[PDB]
Amino acid sequence: DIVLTQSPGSLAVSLGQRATISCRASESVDDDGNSFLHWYQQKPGQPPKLLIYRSSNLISGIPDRFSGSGSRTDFTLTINPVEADDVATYYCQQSNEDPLTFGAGTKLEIKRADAAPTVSIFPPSSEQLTSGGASVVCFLNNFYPKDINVKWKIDGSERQNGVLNSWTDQDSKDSTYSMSSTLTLTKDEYERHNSYTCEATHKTSTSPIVKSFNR
Amino acid sequence: CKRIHIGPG
Amino acid sequence: QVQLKESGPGILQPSQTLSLTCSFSGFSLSTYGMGVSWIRQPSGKGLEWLAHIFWDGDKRYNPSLKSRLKISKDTSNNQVFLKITSVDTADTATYYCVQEGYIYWGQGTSVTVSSAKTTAPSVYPLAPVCGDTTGSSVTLGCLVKGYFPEPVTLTWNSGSLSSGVHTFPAVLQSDLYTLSSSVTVTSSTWPSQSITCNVAHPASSTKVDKKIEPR
């Protein structure tokens, strides 16, 4: 197989600046002359969109901000200036030899200032308790950057079993992240401790931003 | 052999 | 200009056989230089090419998948079919069919290979047990535990409230998905104005309207 390796795997860029992406092939993807490396943009929900074909050729209608260079094994894709709707994943593809391979994808994410998460905690609604299961829910919302950490502490003791974590990607209008962390215990187990608390540590602090409720 | 075509035309 | 559209079994038990059908318009598959590809995308993972058929009847198969695939055509009926045999669970993905040229892609259909049946979900409500973090706003929530299959549709106030809303993507715990949302309102809204969570899980006529009453 011809294996395509893309770097960067992730890209935080500001609007109006330059952004470069790279694809390198395990071998030449060329006849000799034209190359068979193309570039696809994939917006979440949609199919990949072909942008650039045979390394350098722009597909009709794509913005000229999109260019491709390279030959034989080393190819590069440039977006300049990045406008806010190129916040997408980019893939390269080779069609010199079957099987037809694509690379891992680079995703463009906008950069913005730090914002710390407004965490909030939810006990179990009675309803859940009546049917034998308890979920305590922590909402850590509207933060930049992505990387965050959530510790679930019960009575003060750490607890990792049964945490089910979820992120949103880039909130397009304000360029932020939100995350949902659910601890689900049994109603019986739940009824034997008084204190559920949820710890978040973000680049934006020297404290944990902690959230507690007693039963 | 042939080639899966990618791009226009 | 051209249309491509897939048709899938929806859900499959492991180790069955997946049928896929690609319906098109815009080109007969007898036209010289015609052909149709099937590319496969996992959940939030890259692209993988699976197979390709050309107008002159020659088939192309992903050689690490060549075993389990078989492409075919009903050329006087604008149909390309795919059978992927012995469905393992690491075969849940989205199937795209693409016409030659790779410009024109069909939306893609989901297949999930889960040895489980349609469970309709419990929609528990999430209110604070008394406190006000944030700026004289409160976050509320809705917990949709334990369903199959994707998706549920959730709207706060039926779309009469969408700004300030986060709908965290569905994770799966016990082979059963768990989705969650939050809404932030100013305090003058709830408890005064009432906010209700609308969950709809169509594969089962589960249509659950859970109101967030303040405790």
Tab-separated table of C-alpha atoms in Angstrom:
chain	number	residue	atom	x	y	z
A	1	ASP	CA	0.000	0.000	0.000
A	2	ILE	CA	1.135	3.625	-0.427
A	3	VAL	CA	0.781	5.012	3.149
A	4	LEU	CA	0.091	8.767	3.528
A	5	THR	CA	1.189	10.571	6.633
A	6	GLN	CA	-0.265	13.877	7.518
A	7	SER	CA	1.124	16.401	9.900
A	8	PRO	CA	-0.029	18.439	11.709
A	9	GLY	CA	-2.738	16.166	13.307
A	10	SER	CA	-4.367	19.270	14.795
A	11	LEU	CA	-3.961	22.925	13.996
A	12	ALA	CA	-4.982	25.974	16.124
A	13	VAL	CA	-4.805	29.024	13.812
A	14	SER	CA	-6.192	32.563	13.984
A	15	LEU	CA	-8.265	34.077	11.162
A	16	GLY	CA	-6.435	35.911	8.292
A	17	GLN	CA	-3.155	34.169	9.007
A	18	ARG	CA	-1.352	31.462	7.033
A	19	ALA	CA	-1.831	27.786	7.626
A	20	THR	CA	0.203	24.973	6.199
A	21	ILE	CA	-0.658	21.280	6.112
A	22	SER	CA	1.506	18.382	5.002
A	23	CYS	CA	1.125	15.051	3.328
A	24	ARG	CA	4.154	12.588	2.624
A	25	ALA	CA	3.814	9.285	0.713
A	26	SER	CA	5.556	5.961	1.449
A	27	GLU	CA	6.636	6.058	-2.316
A	28	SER	CA	6.365	8.252	-5.468
A	29	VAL	CA	2.765	8.936	-6.411
A	30	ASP	CA	3.832	10.338	-9.799
A	31	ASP	CA	3.838	8.993	-13.450
A	32	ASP	CA	6.686	11.314	-13.849
A	33	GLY	CA	5.418	14.636	-14.435
A	34	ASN	CA	1.926	15.029	-12.909
A	35	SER	CA	1.353	13.600	-9.428
A	36	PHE	CA	-1.613	11.672	-8.041
A	37	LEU	CA	-2.024	13.427	-4.706
A	38	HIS	CA	-5.307	15.326	-4.104
A	39	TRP	CA	-6.769	17.251	-1.156
A	40	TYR	CA	-10.264	16.987	0.347
A	41	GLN	CA	-12.025	19.254	2.841
A	42	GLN	CA	-14.561	17.619	5.190
A	43	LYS	CA	-16.965	19.694	7.212
A	44	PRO	CA	-18.644	17.799	10.105
A	45	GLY	CA	-21.827	16.218	8.818
A	46	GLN	CA	-20.824	16.411	5.164
A	47	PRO	CA	-18.971	14.197	2.712
A	48	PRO	CA	-15.340	15.116	1.889
A	49	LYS	CA	-15.178	17.898	-0.722
A	50	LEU	CA	-12.494	17.725	-3.380
A	51	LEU	CA	-10.485	20.939	-3.405
A	52	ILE	CA	-7.256	20.383	-5.272
A	53	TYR	CA	-6.384	17.595	-7.756
A	54	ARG	CA	-2.966	16.305	-8.966
A	55	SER	CA	-1.131	18.322	-6.354
A	56	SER	CA	-1.538	21.804	-7.680
A	57	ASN	CA	-4.805	22.162	-9.579
A	58	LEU	CA	-7.653	23.953	-7.920
A	59	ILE	CA	-11.088	22.475	-8.572
A	60	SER	CA	-13.396	25.081	-10.265
A	61	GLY	CA	-15.020	27.326	-7.693
A	62	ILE	CA	-12.661	26.644	-4.755
A	63	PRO	CA	-11.029	29.850	-3.242
A	64	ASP	CA	-7.566	30.695	-4.535
A	65	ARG	CA	-6.386	30.821	-0.982
A	66	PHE	CA	-6.010	27.039	-1.372
A	67	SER	CA	-2.815	25.893	-3.008
A	68	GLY	CA	-0.883	22.740	-3.362
A	69	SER	CA	2.714	22.091	-4.046
A	70	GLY	CA	5.143	19.114	-3.996
A	71	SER	CA	6.128	16.112	-6.101
A	72	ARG	CA	7.203	12.433	-5.825
A	73	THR	CA	6.712	11.839	-2.003
A	74	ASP	CA	6.361	15.247	-0.341
A	75	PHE	CA	3.300	17.282	-0.669
A	76	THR	CA	1.986	20.377	1.111
A	77	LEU	CA	-1.350	22.249	1.248
A	78	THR	CA	-1.541	26.001	2.066
A	79	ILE	CA	-4.542	28.075	3.154
A	80	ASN	CA	-3.847	31.737	3.215
A	81	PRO	CA	-5.525	33.758	4.664
A	82	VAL	CA	-7.532	31.209	6.837
A	83	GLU	CA	-11.098	32.421	6.889
A	84	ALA	CA	-13.314	31.044	9.688
A	85	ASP	CA	-15.094	28.599	7.501
A	86	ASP	CA	-12.018	26.501	6.729
A	87	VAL	CA	-12.362	25.077	10.248
A	88	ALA	CA	-12.567	21.630	8.941
A	89	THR	CA	-10.657	18.447	8.598
A	90	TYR	CA	-8.297	18.118	5.619
A	91	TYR	CA	-7.212	14.891	4.113
A	92	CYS	CA	-4.824	13.991	1.410
A	93	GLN	CA	-5.395	11.187	-1.033
A	94	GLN	CA	-3.309	9.259	-3.459
A	95	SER	CA	-4.603	7.660	-6.638
A	96	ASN	CA	-1.429	6.375	-8.214
A	97	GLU	CA	-1.939	2.788	-6.953
A	98	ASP	CA	-4.853	0.890	-5.612
A	99	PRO	CA	-5.704	0.467	-2.924
A	100	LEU	CA	-6.676	4.044	-2.800
A	101	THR	CA	-5.394	5.528	0.386
A	102	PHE	CA	-6.143	8.717	2.334
A	103	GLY	CA	-4.119	10.191	5.297
A	104	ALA	CA	-5.234	10.522	8.957
A	105	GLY	CA	-6.669	14.054	8.469
A	106	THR	CA	-5.451	17.419	9.821
A	107	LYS	CA	-8.130	19.418	11.618
A	108	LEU	CA	-8.154	23.142	11.597
A	109	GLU	CA	-9.408	24.674	14.780
A	110	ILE	CA	-9.568	28.493	15.383
A	111	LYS	CA	-7.368	29.927	18.162
A	112	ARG	CA	-8.840	32.398	20.721
A	113	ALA	CA	-8.128	33.758	24.185
A	114	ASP	CA	-8.364	31.578	27.240
A	115	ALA	CA	-11.669	31.212	28.861
A	116	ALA	CA	-12.173	29.107	31.924
A	117	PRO	CA	-15.136	26.642	32.141
A	118	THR	CA	-18.341	27.495	34.049
A	119	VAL	CA	-18.815	24.132	35.701
A	120	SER	CA	-22.226	23.241	37.255
A	121	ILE	CA	-23.418	20.127	39.046
A	122	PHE	CA	-26.567	18.029	38.856
A	123	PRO	CA	-27.731	15.439	41.417
A	124	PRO	CA	-30.036	12.649	40.340
A	125	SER	CA	-33.599	13.534	39.557
A	126	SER	CA	-35.819	11.578	41.886
A	127	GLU	CA	-37.158	9.738	38.849
A	128	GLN	CA	-33.892	8.073	38.203
A	129	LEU	CA	-33.608	7.153	41.882
A	130	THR	CA	-37.072	5.571	41.847
A	131	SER	CA	-35.849	3.110	39.155
A	132	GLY	CA	-32.618	1.926	40.911
A	133	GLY	CA	-29.922	4.023	39.123
A	134	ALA	CA	-28.134	7.257	40.071
A	135	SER	CA	-26.442	9.679	37.697
A	136	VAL	CA	-24.686	12.782	39.034
A	137	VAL	CA	-23.876	15.143	36.060
A	138	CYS	CA	-21.197	17.825	35.775
A	139	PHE	CA	-21.455	20.504	33.022
A	140	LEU	CA	-18.084	22.171	32.380
A	141	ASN	CA	-19.119	24.753	29.709
A	142	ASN	CA	-17.563	27.426	27.430
A	143	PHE	CA	-13.831	27.035	27.743
A	144	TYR	CA	-10.755	27.484	25.615
A	145	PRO	CA	-8.481	25.395	25.139
A	146	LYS	CA	-9.782	21.871	24.709
A	147	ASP	CA	-7.684	19.985	27.207
A	148	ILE	CA	-9.398	19.716	30.528
A	149	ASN	CA	-9.507	17.164	33.333
A	150	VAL	CA	-12.427	16.139	35.590
A	151	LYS	CA	-11.900	14.278	38.989
A	152	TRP	CA	-14.964	12.627	40.588
A	153	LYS	CA	-14.642	12.599	44.327
A	154	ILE	CA	-17.260	10.893	46.633
A	155	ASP	CA	-17.116	11.723	50.528
A	156	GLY	CA	-13.690	13.089	49.541
A	157	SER	CA	-12.392	9.800	48.020
A	158	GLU	CA	-11.418	9.784	44.341
A	159	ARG	CA	-13.759	7.687	42.056
A	160	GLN	CA	-13.070	6.719	38.360
A	161	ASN	CA	-15.263	3.695	37.646
A	162	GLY	CA	-18.373	4.693	35.741
A	163	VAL	CA	-17.483	8.054	34.414
A	164	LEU	CA	-18.750	8.615	30.896
A	165	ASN	CA	-17.170	11.731	29.381
A	166	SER	CA	-18.359	13.791	26.354
A	167	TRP	CA	-17.082	16.819	24.267
A	168	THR	CA	-18.528	19.162	21.788
A	169	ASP	CA	-16.134	20.309	19.093
A	170	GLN	CA	-15.395	24.044	18.264
A	171	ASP	CA	-18.564	26.109	19.205
A	172	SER	CA	-18.451	28.121	15.905
A	173	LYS	CA	-19.899	31.335	17.331
A	174	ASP	CA	-17.344	32.091	20.073
A	175	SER	CA	-14.895	29.350	19.257
A	176	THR	CA	-15.143	27.435	22.456
A	177	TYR	CA	-15.486	23.938	24.012
A	178	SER	CA	-18.050	22.344	26.336
A	179	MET	CA	-17.975	19.012	28.039
A	180	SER	CA	-20.428	16.799	29.906
A	181	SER	CA	-19.141	14.378	32.600
A	182	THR	CA	-21.574	11.759	33.946
A	183	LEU	CA	-20.883	9.497	37.028
A	184	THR	CA	-23.457	6.761	37.217
A	185	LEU	CA	-23.687	4.738	40.429
A	186	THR	CA	-26.451	2.439	41.715
A	187	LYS	CA	-29.231	4.070	43.823
A	188	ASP	CA	-28.147	1.882	46.792
A	189	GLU	CA	-24.532	2.838	46.598
A	190	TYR	CA	-25.534	6.424	46.053
A	191	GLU	CA	-27.630	6.424	49.195
A	192	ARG	CA	-24.695	5.580	51.397
A	193	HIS	CA	-22.503	8.696	50.916
A	194	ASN	CA	-23.277	12.340	51.585
A	195	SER	CA	-20.819	14.149	49.291
A	196	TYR	CA	-20.521	14.217	45.474
A	197	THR	CA	-18.096	16.737	44.095
A	198	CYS	CA	-16.512	17.319	40.646
A	199	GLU	CA	-13.016	18.703	40.055
A	200	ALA	CA	-11.898	20.455	36.883
A	201	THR	CA	-8.347	21.551	36.290
A	202	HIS	CA	-7.805	23.827	33.282
A	203	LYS	CA	-4.720	25.651	31.968
A	204	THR	CA	-6.641	28.736	33.278
A	205	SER	CA	-6.076	27.815	36.988
A	206	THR	CA	-3.959	27.003	39.979
A	207	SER	CA	-6.947	25.811	41.877
A	208	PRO	CA	-9.124	23.016	40.746
A	209	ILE	CA	-12.460	24.715	39.801
A	210	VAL	CA	-14.436	22.403	42.113
A	211	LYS	CA	-18.226	21.678	42.325
A	212	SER	CA	-19.857	20.164	45.341
A	213	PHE	CA	-23.245	19.194	46.632
A	214	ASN	CA	-24.023	17.330	49.930
A	215	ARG	CA	-27.060	14.984	50.048
B	1	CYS	CA	-4.776	-1.871	-16.025
B	2	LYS	CA	-6.726	1.348	-15.616
B	3	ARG	CA	-6.852	4.071	-13.043
B	4	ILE	CA	-9.653	5.309	-10.791
B	5	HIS	CA	-9.910	8.940	-12.013
B	6	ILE	CA	-9.880	11.831	-9.561
B	7	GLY	CA	-10.349	15.520	-10.482
B	8	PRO	CA	-12.463	16.884	-13.489
B	9	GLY	CA	-12.951	15.774	-17.142
C	1	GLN	CA	-26.220	18.290	-11.022
C	2	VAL	CA	-25.643	14.473	-10.548
C	3	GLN	CA	-27.235	12.536	-7.601
C	4	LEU	CA	-25.852	9.664	-5.579
C	5	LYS	CA	-27.813	7.952	-2.698
C	6	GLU	CA	-27.261	4.989	-0.473
C	7	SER	CA	-29.512	2.393	1.042
C	8	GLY	CA	-28.549	0.439	4.120
C	9	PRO	CA	-29.789	-2.309	6.483
C	10	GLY	CA	-29.648	0.308	9.290
C	11	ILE	CA	-28.583	-2.040	12.175
C	12	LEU	CA	-26.946	-5.505	11.803
C	13	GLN	CA	-26.141	-8.313	14.152
C	14	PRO	CA	-22.444	-9.217	14.171
C	15	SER	CA	-21.517	-11.717	11.681
C	16	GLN	CA	-24.310	-11.150	9.320
C	17	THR	CA	-23.747	-9.704	5.743
C	18	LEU	CA	-24.117	-6.036	4.843
C	19	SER	CA	-26.028	-5.021	1.737
C	20	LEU	CA	-25.570	-1.603	0.322
C	21	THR	CA	-27.114	-0.017	-2.687
C	22	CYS	CA	-26.048	3.116	-4.497
C	23	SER	CA	-28.711	4.880	-6.528
C	24	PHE	CA	-27.766	7.463	-8.990
C	25	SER	CA	-28.707	9.947	-11.554
C	26	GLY	CA	-26.674	12.059	-13.927
C	27	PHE	CA	-24.844	9.277	-15.812
C	28	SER	CA	-25.413	5.770	-17.183
C	29	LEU	CA	-22.779	3.297	-16.069
C	30	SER	CA	-22.361	2.110	-19.680
C	31	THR	CA	-20.678	5.404	-20.727
C	32	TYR	CA	-16.984	4.874	-21.405
C	33	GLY	CA	-14.928	6.067	-18.459
C	34	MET	CA	-17.813	5.646	-16.063
C	35	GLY	CA	-17.539	3.865	-12.743
C	36	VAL	CA	-18.589	4.078	-9.056
C	37	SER	CA	-16.585	3.823	-5.830
C	38	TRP	CA	-17.549	2.948	-2.238
C	39	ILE	CA	-15.485	4.724	0.453
C	40	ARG	CA	-16.158	4.014	4.145
C	41	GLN	CA	-15.880	6.304	7.140
C	42	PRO	CA	-15.833	5.101	10.765
C	43	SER	CA	-17.223	7.329	13.589
C	44	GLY	CA	-15.147	10.419	13.673
C	45	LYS	CA	-12.225	8.649	12.068
C	46	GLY	CA	-10.707	8.887	8.605
C	47	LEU	CA	-11.587	7.712	5.182
C	48	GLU	CA	-11.060	4.213	3.928
C	49	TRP	CA	-11.632	3.166	0.211
C	50	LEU	CA	-13.443	-0.212	-0.099
C	51	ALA	CA	-14.213	-1.024	-3.676
C	52	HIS	CA	-14.712	0.341	-7.192
C	53	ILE	CA	-16.608	-0.841	-10.306
C	54	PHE	CA	-15.962	0.365	-13.842
C	55	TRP	CA	-18.381	0.623	-16.842
C	56	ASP	CA	-16.632	-2.319	-18.587
C	57	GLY	CA	-17.345	-4.578	-15.675
C	58	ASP	CA	-13.916	-4.489	-13.903
C	59	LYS	CA	-14.024	-4.501	-10.216
C	60	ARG	CA	-11.420	-3.312	-7.764
C	61	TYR	CA	-11.238	-4.381	-4.179
C	62	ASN	CA	-9.476	-3.157	-1.080
C	63	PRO	CA	-6.942	-6.069	-0.819
C	64	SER	CA	-7.042	-6.309	2.934
C	65	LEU	CA	-10.844	-6.269	2.559
C	66	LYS	CA	-10.908	-8.175	-0.843
C	67	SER	CA	-12.018	-11.245	1.004
C	68	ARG	CA	-15.320	-9.849	2.396
C	69	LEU	CA	-16.285	-7.414	-0.405
C	70	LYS	CA	-18.200	-7.907	-3.726
C	71	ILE	CA	-19.365	-5.042	-5.961
C	72	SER	CA	-21.854	-5.359	-8.772
C	73	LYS	CA	-24.031	-3.442	-11.068
C	74	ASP	CA	-27.440	-3.225	-12.449
C	75	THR	CA	-26.404	-0.931	-15.198
C	76	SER	CA	-29.942	-0.445	-16.801
C	77	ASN	CA	-31.176	0.528	-13.375
C	78	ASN	CA	-28.499	3.081	-12.222
C	79	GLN	CA	-27.471	0.821	-9.311
C	80	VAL	CA	-24.213	-0.272	-7.830
C	81	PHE	CA	-24.408	-2.699	-4.908
C	82	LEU	CA	-21.935	-3.758	-2.318
C	83	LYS	CA	-21.898	-6.800	-0.104
C	84	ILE	CA	-19.620	-6.870	2.774
C	85	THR	CA	-19.688	-10.303	4.345
C	86	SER	CA	-19.320	-11.428	8.049
C	87	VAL	CA	-19.848	-8.051	9.727
C	88	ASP	CA	-17.546	-7.560	12.651
C	89	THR	CA	-18.338	-4.684	15.039
C	90	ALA	CA	-15.298	-2.743	13.684
C	91	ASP	CA	-17.345	-2.333	10.530
C	92	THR	CA	-19.788	0.180	11.955
C	93	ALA	CA	-19.283	3.165	9.650
C	94	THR	CA	-20.711	5.451	6.963
C	95	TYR	CA	-20.816	4.358	3.424
C	96	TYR	CA	-20.402	6.823	0.720
C	97	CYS	CA	-20.719	6.082	-2.942
C	98	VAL	CA	-18.796	8.310	-5.147
C	99	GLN	CA	-18.982	8.626	-8.944
C	100	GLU	CA	-15.664	8.494	-10.794
C	101	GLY	CA	-13.863	11.871	-10.637
C	102	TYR	CA	-14.456	12.041	-6.937
C	103	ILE	CA	-16.183	15.381	-7.098
C	104	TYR	CA	-19.684	14.096	-6.799
C	105	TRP	CA	-20.284	12.347	-3.480
C	106	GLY	CA	-23.492	10.858	-2.078
C	107	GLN	CA	-24.407	11.806	1.559
C	108	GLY	CA	-23.570	8.465	3.011
C	109	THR	CA	-25.499	6.020	5.093
C	110	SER	CA	-24.854	4.712	8.648
C	111	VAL	CA	-24.444	1.103	9.658
C	112	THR	CA	-23.906	0.068	13.220
C	113	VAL	CA	-23.074	-3.571	13.987
C	114	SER	CA	-24.389	-4.017	17.426
C	115	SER	CA	-25.723	-7.261	18.840
C	116	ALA	CA	-28.561	-5.347	20.548
C	117	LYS	CA	-32.108	-4.311	19.940
C	118	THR	CA	-34.118	-1.073	19.788
C	119	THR	CA	-34.297	0.212	23.378
C	120	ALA	CA	-36.256	3.530	23.700
C	121	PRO	CA	-34.579	5.999	26.235
C	122	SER	CA	-35.286	7.350	29.814
C	123	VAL	CA	-35.355	11.186	29.749
C	124	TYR	CA	-34.464	12.451	33.199
C	125	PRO	CA	-34.498	16.208	34.062
C	126	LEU	CA	-31.663	18.204	35.678
C	127	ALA	CA	-32.172	21.284	37.894
C	128	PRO	CA	-29.894	22.772	40.680
C	129	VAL	CA	-30.709	21.708	44.389
C	130	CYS	CA	-30.211	25.396	45.347
C	131	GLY	CA	-27.477	27.747	44.431
C	132	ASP	CA	-26.637	30.368	41.620
C	133	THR	CA	-23.098	30.133	40.067
C	134	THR	CA	-22.617	31.932	36.638
C	135	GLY	CA	-23.700	35.627	36.235
C	136	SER	CA	-27.336	35.474	37.676
C	137	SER	CA	-28.074	32.775	35.266
C	138	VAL	CA	-28.658	29.108	35.893
C	139	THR	CA	-27.734	26.031	33.854
C	140	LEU	CA	-30.393	23.328	33.420
C	141	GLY	CA	-30.258	19.971	31.804
C	142	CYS	CA	-31.721	16.952	30.252
C	143	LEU	CA	-30.312	13.389	30.573
C	144	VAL	CA	-31.329	10.853	27.994
C	145	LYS	CA	-30.086	7.529	29.385
C	146	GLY	CA	-29.790	4.203	27.637
C	147	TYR	CA	-31.094	4.079	24.114
C	148	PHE	CA	-30.558	2.282	20.834
C	149	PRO	CA	-30.228	3.320	18.027
C	150	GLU	CA	-28.923	6.758	17.272
C	151	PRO	CA	-30.441	9.248	17.101
C	152	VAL	CA	-32.632	11.161	19.345
C	153	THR	CA	-33.556	14.737	18.419
C	154	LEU	CA	-33.653	17.149	21.493
C	155	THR	CA	-35.053	20.675	21.578
C	156	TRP	CA	-35.474	23.037	24.543
C	157	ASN	CA	-38.857	24.841	24.377
C	158	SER	CA	-39.175	23.308	20.885
C	159	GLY	CA	-36.516	25.620	19.374
C	160	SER	CA	-38.073	28.550	21.095
C	161	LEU	CA	-34.946	28.189	23.136
C	162	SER	CA	-31.664	27.371	21.332
C	163	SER	CA	-29.226	30.145	22.275
C	164	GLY	CA	-27.369	29.108	25.363
C	165	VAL	CA	-27.988	25.355	24.614
C	166	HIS	CA	-25.287	22.553	24.552
C	167	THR	CA	-26.144	19.095	23.212
C	168	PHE	CA	-23.326	16.869	24.052
C	169	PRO	CA	-22.832	14.036	21.508
C	170	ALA	CA	-23.902	10.524	22.381
C	171	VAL	CA	-21.485	8.182	24.100
C	172	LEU	CA	-22.406	4.410	24.599
C	173	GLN	CA	-22.150	2.714	27.785
C	174	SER	CA	-23.629	-0.862	28.019
C	175	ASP	CA	-23.908	-1.203	24.139
C	176	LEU	CA	-26.600	1.534	24.844
C	177	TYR	CA	-26.156	5.222	24.089
C	178	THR	CA	-26.307	8.082	26.500
C	179	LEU	CA	-26.862	11.573	25.352
C	180	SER	CA	-27.050	14.874	27.337
C	181	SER	CA	-27.888	18.560	26.968
C	182	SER	CA	-27.721	21.788	28.925
C	183	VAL	CA	-29.322	25.287	28.633
C	184	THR	CA	-28.298	28.517	30.326
C	185	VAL	CA	-31.022	31.034	31.083
C	186	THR	CA	-31.037	34.407	32.939
C	187	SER	CA	-32.802	33.995	36.395
C	188	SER	CA	-35.900	35.953	35.231
C	189	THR	CA	-36.706	33.045	32.927
C	190	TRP	CA	-36.871	29.874	35.107
C	191	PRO	CA	-38.251	29.528	37.674
C	192	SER	CA	-40.677	32.289	36.195
C	193	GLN	CA	-40.883	31.313	32.536
C	194	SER	CA	-41.110	27.450	32.238
C	195	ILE	CA	-38.520	25.378	30.353
C	196	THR	CA	-39.241	21.996	29.085
C	197	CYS	CA	-36.951	19.452	27.422
C	198	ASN	CA	-38.230	17.749	24.229
C	199	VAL	CA	-36.654	14.412	23.441
C	200	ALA	CA	-37.605	12.416	20.273
C	201	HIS	CA	-36.288	8.954	19.471
C	202	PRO	CA	-38.007	8.066	16.173
C	203	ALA	CA	-37.023	4.350	15.804
C	204	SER	CA	-39.690	3.659	18.400
C	205	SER	CA	-42.468	6.347	18.709
C	206	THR	CA	-40.904	7.612	21.852
C	207	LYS	CA	-41.657	11.274	21.946
C	208	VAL	CA	-40.787	12.476	25.533
C	209	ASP	CA	-41.515	15.946	26.775
C	210	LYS	CA	-39.778	16.409	30.190
C	211	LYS	CA	-40.377	19.591	32.091
C	212	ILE	CA	-37.687	20.919	34.392
C	213	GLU	CA	-39.706	21.690	37.562
C	214	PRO	CA	-37.602	23.562	40.258
C	215	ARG	CA	-36.859	21.704	43.311
